[PDB]
């Protein structure tokens, strides 16, 4: 039981690490894509200089 509990605690710690990693990756990717979408605006001028 003690060895089993050690394995279970390792699994819990890895789960919490992956929880935080998923929160960070999700938030960063979502924010990047959403800001890319939001700041895509129509041209101020019909004929922009290129």
């Amino acid at each position: 039981d003690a060895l089993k509990e050690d394995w279970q605690f390792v699994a819990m710690v890895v789960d919490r690490l992956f929880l935080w990693t998923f929160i960070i990756f999700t938030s960063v990717g979502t924010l990047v894509i959403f800001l890319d979408a939001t700041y895509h605006l129509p041209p101020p001028d019909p004929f922009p200089s290129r």
Binding site: E5, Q8, F9, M12
Partner: protein
């Protein structure tokens, strides 16, 4: 308000080859008791008309519209418009979409009565979410993608999806609480006082 919506369609008639300078448009005049009156409505034969299977005609006015600002030699000066105010008959949508969708959404509250030991709480909640997604797939083919408003069924489906997602999160939290053990968590006396004595007494729990 879809599927409880009413629409305001119109049929605008004018002449592009002639203007108000050359032809004057007017409404037809009928008679009764040697008194003339204008026909200010769409004529519907009461005996021959077969009603549309989804739309009921509530009002059907007719009007002569003259734009005072346009010049008399413009084609846009005069027109006659026949309007149809039509109410949708929502029986089809009710029976085939709304009652099943509402019942499936409301079933998600049953997860709070399922024990954590059944091992099927989150499956029920996420399956309700999947069924709502299928219903959203169904509705997406039936209305235009306009931005003037969210349709009423769309509002309900979004509200139900948000509530079901909240219920899934709650089920996750409840299961996490249920499966705690001394080897992994510490149960404080305050938590025991709150959740095992005070709240069950307030909630009239068995």
């Amino acid at each position: 308000y879809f599927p409880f919506d009413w629409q305001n369609c119109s049929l605008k008639f004018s002449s592009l080859k002639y203007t108000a300078k050359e032809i004057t448009l007017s409404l037809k005049q009928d008679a009764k008791e040697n008194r003339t009156y204008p026909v200010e409505w769409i004529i519907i034969d009461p005996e021959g008309f077969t009603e549309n299977g989804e739309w009921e005609i509530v009002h059907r006015p007719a009007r002569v519209n003259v734009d005072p600002r346009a010049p008399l030699d413009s084609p846009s000066r005069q027109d006659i418009t026949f309007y149809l105010i039509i109410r949708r008959k929502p029986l089809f949508y009710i029976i085939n979409i709304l009652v099943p969708c509402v019942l499936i959404s409301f079933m998600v509250n049953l997860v709070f009565y399922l024990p954590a030991d059944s091992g099927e709480k989150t499956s029920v909640a996420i399956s309700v979410l999947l069924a709502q997604s299928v219903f959203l797939l169904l509705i997406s083919k039936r209305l235009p993608a306009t931005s003037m408003a969210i349709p009423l069924i769309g509002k309900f489906l979004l509200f139900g999806m948000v509530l079901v997602t909240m219920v899934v999160v709650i089920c996750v939290i409840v299961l996490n609480i249920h499966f705690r053990t001394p080897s992994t968590h510490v149960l404080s006396e305050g938590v025991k006082k709150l959740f095992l004595e005070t709240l069950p007494e307030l909630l009239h729990m068995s």
